Design an enzyme around this catalytic site. Structure first.
Site, short mmCIF file in Angstrom:
data_model
loop_
_atom_site.label_atom_id
_atom_site.label_comp_id
_atom_site.label_asym_id
_atom_site.label_seq_id
_atom_site.Cartn_x
_atom_site.Cartn_y
_atom_site.Cartn_z
N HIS A 147 52.93 63.89 32.60
CA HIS A 147 54.39 63.96 32.28
C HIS A 147 55.18 64.51 33.55
O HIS A 147 56.32 63.85 33.54
CB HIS A 147 54.53 64.84 30.95
CG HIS A 147 56.27 64.82 30.61
ND1 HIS A 147 56.87 65.77 31.70
CD2 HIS A 147 57.05 64.07 29.96
CE1 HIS A 147 58.13 65.80 31.14
NE2 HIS A 147 58.29 64.75 30.08
N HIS A 166 44.94 57.85 26.26
CA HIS A 166 44.74 57.96 24.64
C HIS A 166 43.34 57.91 24.31
O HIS A 166 42.77 57.37 23.10
CB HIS A 166 45.79 57.09 24.10
CG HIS A 166 46.99 57.09 24.04
ND1 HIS A 166 47.73 57.78 25.36
CD2 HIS A 166 48.11 56.82 23.36
CE1 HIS A 166 49.05 57.79 25.23
NE2 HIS A 166 49.25 57.45 23.82
#
Ligand code: HEM
Lengths: 560, 666
Positions: free
Chosen positions: A71, A182
């Site tokens: 992020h 993920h």
């Protein structure tokens, strides 16, 4: 008074007075003495502990560190270069769980303090968590100095396409990142099994044909997935660190990657001081005017983005296709002649030199610009010697990704008086943004513009900025003629962006552009112009211009 | 800024935005210029009318006087900002205010003078000098002038001529109030109004709606100018700057008592001006139509504003105004003194004035300090004075509090206050609530006085110590003892030379504004504040010309040292008191402590640990560092493990800077 005014505050952002460590602190020398083994051990022992004020999900802060690493490095914009992992003050939509979790790493930075910045710490914690999961990473490179002041349907498929293309990520890297972050193959198996019950994002990998091709290829071959994820992650965290010479620590890989814009390492012995004088006397009698040399040496050294620290004069890319094809560099003018003459000079010098002293074209372009500046200054009554530090090498064509360099093309160059069609902001705002990108200050920008005008470095050699009757001379005539109140400016009859400073019994003189008059109009910039436009400010202007020019030329020199 | 902390106000005017670069002192350059040549050049540019802005009566005098007045007319006592100072009138909202109309021209009329000198004459000095020179060019001998107003390169963050209703009696109170905010009494206000309006006229004449935009919104074709009039030729014979069209005196290019003889010569009626309206004219047959037309033609009529007529109706103004109408030499004297105070109000102590024109006389409003009349202490005596201070029974908390109280009254906006003068002993400052007299301050003063008597009695010759030096010396000795207790061996630099003023030297009335309504470093959230505690702390730090790292380290040192107001435990995050450590930082960042507002809601918080016990108590000032992201980045620099000596060095540097803030004589 009036809002939406010119903001000179952007130029001097992050000064040296707000820095707690002062001017006697270089982060490179500190982080080069760090022990990455103890750092990894500390990161791991933080990873395997449950802080009472933040419930450690499954007793392992790994995925949280991965999320913060992905992020902080997800805000990189190719069109500007701002943001990014280290080249952007991500500290100072979001759920605020990206800075309260930044306090989990305080027990690590407590031990190291100034030997490890927050920007390096977050990314390295993410990398160490990734390596601790079981995955093996390509490598890591320290050296991110932290700033001190804030500056199912296919529709999701194309949305992800655009979002990841804004980060300079192709289809294979996007698929690798999405499948990795993920995640073994616990993802592709369940995704390609029973269609995920036919009920948003991360499913389009099986819908979009180009994504589906790569994913179904990776379904039975996890080796490609592992290699591609390692490469994509390394590209992601190290996107805006600039040249490979800025990487530090013992974890940096030996391999060189194309997206870094690599340049060959120095293989010969650099030029001393007698050879520099010989070259500066050879390309001062080669038939090249000061305008051509200055414009060429500025074209190569004004493609630098101080945000992600890519571009610059190093590498000799002005001779190669992406840089020479740009409209602002004017391939239809005198760039090919200058390049050919410099190549001839380099070939002549390298074939007749003592021992194994050899000069490179990238070095020779900047040396020619310096020689032209010295000649112009000497033709103005002064006697100076502009400093020049050798050590550049010229990259070949195969090492320059043409697409990766398309984002460095200047839509509007204020110093060269260029202005391309389709500009968001007016001319002066783009000049301000360009000066901010070059890590310049207001006096440096002012003196650089005022010198480049009289040196005839304008685009197509237009007279829009030359406020002097004697070109080929480094004087402050631009400032002393801009401040003159004896001429009455007015918009040009042709309705273009140019103006007309007509006086002298109605005569028309000093046809001026917008980025020229903004210096005399804006009071804050007019202060600096008056500083450089005084009667006794003639040598001070020359010295300041030399300092600014040398600073701009050596912006990319990170190996020194 | 008023809704979220704006840390960029602390680093205002950085050194990277200064074209002159570092190692450039304005005093040396401006002290070596030819003042006579400067005045001759200014008088030369005054009398040559330019064709792009014609001169009334062929003289730019009144325009320069008005520009000088408006440059120094923005001073306000409470904040201290404004005035001539750094010459903000060039680049600010100030250049675009409607009451600063046509003053952008008067700064370009002076460009031929600035370019002949360059860095040897700052803009701020020039703007207020020309008007001063203008005053001398008419036939009025001024008091003096002092160069030295350093020039800044970045803007900072900081009267109706028609009354709305022009009632002179109701406008006199407005004049008095707006001149009270400049520290001007009634006599000075009347002298400034009468003298300043002896020279010049009012320009506004026309539709008054055909004026262009301000320079901050004008097109680049005007090159920094604004208010481009379109009516008529635009400038000169039909300029429009304010709207009112009045010419005060018969000779607006000379000094005489013709203002009073006109004001007290006719009765006045009310009429509408050609631009705007609501101006006073002569009553009986329009008076005598004998006033010079600025560019030639018919004679005008005696006219005054409503502001000028107030001086006739207000009983306070009327008596002194009539007295001046009788005796004009008193008017000249008060005008000279008031003008000198006006242009030099925010220039600091007399030690900053430079040039030959500065007078040798001292004035009360400067807060004078006596000249040094002995040989200063060297280094052998200081090492003994520190020992005597340390072994005098004064705890480090008292010494640090006294030194900070003496030296935190400074404000860099107008450079008044400071540890110099030794006025912590005197009435205006010894009684302030923040300088707590209900406690151990008078005791510290008495102990320092007896130490001074003991030292001066046993003097080794012509070497004596002053109380103003003794306060700062005691502060430095206390900090040295605290650091030695913490383990580090350092020596706080001390530069003697301060002197102790007397009660007659100081003015009690003019120090009512230096009182700190909220001192962030010693909590003291005093009643009657316009902002929360943290914003007041930022304002205080910006007044002291401190940066962000210096402010953070100074707060973190003053907490653990024990400088708090009333010695409250409200912010002392250290366990071993009277020691100089970074325990305020390593305990503010401690994430094992949860902060909740105290049950007795008064603005203070309680830091409970994980065992359900109230460990620390803090305030908004103490907790703003651990919450604000920009400030927490600085705390993590001094809050690291290895950064104990760096913290100590930074605190000592900040203490040195604060102590030597108001030291311009050295
Ligand atoms: C409440 C106090 C005052 C008010 C309301 C006031 C009003 C005005 C106004 C509205 C103007 C604009 C005229 C124009 O632009 O043509 C003006 C100009 C002027 N004022 Fe003031 N004034 C005051 C005090 C002063 C002071 C303190 C001084 C000098 C120390 C002064 C000297 C001048 C001068 C020299 C001019 C320009 C004359 C000219 O341009 O010919 N006035 N005044």
């Amino acid at each position: 008074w009036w809002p939406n005014r010119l903001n000179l505050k952007v130029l001097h952002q992050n000064p040296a007075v707000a820095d707690p460590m002062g001017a006697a602190f270089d982060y490179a020398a500190e982080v080069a003495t760090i022990d990455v083994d103890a750092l990894t051990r500390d990161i791991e022992e933080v990873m395997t502990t449950s802080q009472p004020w933040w419930p450690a999900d499954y007793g392992h802060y790994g995925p949280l560190f991965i999320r913060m690493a992905r992020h902080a490095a997800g805000t990189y914009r190719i069109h500007d270069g701002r943001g990014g992992a280290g080249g952007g003050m991500q500290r100072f939509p979001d759920n605020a769980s990206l800075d309260k979790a930044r306090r989990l790493l305080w027990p690590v930075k407590k031990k190291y303090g100034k030997k490890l910045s927050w920007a390096d710490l977050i990314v390295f914690a993410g990398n160490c968590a990734l390596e601790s999961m079981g995955f093996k990473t390509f490598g890591f490179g320290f050296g991110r100095v932290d700033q001190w002041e804030p500056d199912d349907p296919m529709a999701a498929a194309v949305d992800i396409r655009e979002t990841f293309r804004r980060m300079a990520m192709n289809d294979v890297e996007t698929a690798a990142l999405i499948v990795g972050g993920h995640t073994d193959n616990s993802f592709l198996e369940i995704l390609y099994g029973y269609e995920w019950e036919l009920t948003a994002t991360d499913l389009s990998l099986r819908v979009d044909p180009i994504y589906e091709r790569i994913t179904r290829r990776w379904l039975e071959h996890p080796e490609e997935l592992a290699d591609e994820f390692a490469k994509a992650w390394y590209k992601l965290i190290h996107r805006d660190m600039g040249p490979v010479a800025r990487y530090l620590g013992p974890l940096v890989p030996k391999q060189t990657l194309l997206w870094q814009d690599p340049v060959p390492a120095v293989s010969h012995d650099l030029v001393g001081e007698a050879e520099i004088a010989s070259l500066k006397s050879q390309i001062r009698a080669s038939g090249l005017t000061v305008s051509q040399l200055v414009s060429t040496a500025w074209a190569a050294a004004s493609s630098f983005r101080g945000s992600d620290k890519r571009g610059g004069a190093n590498g000799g890319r002005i001779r190669l296709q992406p840089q020479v094809g740009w409209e602002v560099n004017d391939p239809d003018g005198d760039l090919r002649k200058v390049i050919r003459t410099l190549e001839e000079i380099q070939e002549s010098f390298n074939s007749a030199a003592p021992g194994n002293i050899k000069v490179s074209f990238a070095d020779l372009v900047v040396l020619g610009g310096c020689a032209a500046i010295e000649k112009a200054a000497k033709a103005a009554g002064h006697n100076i010697t502009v400093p020049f530090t050798p050590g550049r090498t010229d990259a070949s064509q195969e090492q320059t990704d043409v697409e990766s360099f398309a984002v460095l093309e200047p839509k509007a160059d204020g110093f060269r008086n260029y202005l391309g069609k389709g500009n968001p902001l007016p001319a002066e705002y783009m000049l301000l943004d360009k000066a901010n990108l070059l890590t310049l200050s207001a006096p440096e920008m002012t003196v650089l513009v005022g010198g480049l005008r009289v040196l005839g470095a304008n685009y197509k050699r237009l007279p829009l900025g030359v406020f002097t009757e004697a070109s080929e001379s480094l004087t402050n005539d631009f400032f002393v003629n801009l401040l003159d109140m004896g001429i009455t400016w007015e918009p040009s009859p042709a309705d273009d962006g140019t103006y007309q400073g007509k006086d002298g019994s109605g005569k028309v003189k000093w046809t001026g552009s917008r980025v020229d008059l903004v210096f005399g109009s804006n009071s804050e910039l007019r202060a600096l112009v008056e500083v450089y436009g005084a009667d006794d400010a003639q040598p001070k202007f020359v010295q300041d211009f030399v300092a600014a020019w040398d600073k701009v030329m050596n912006l990319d020199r990170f190996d020194v």
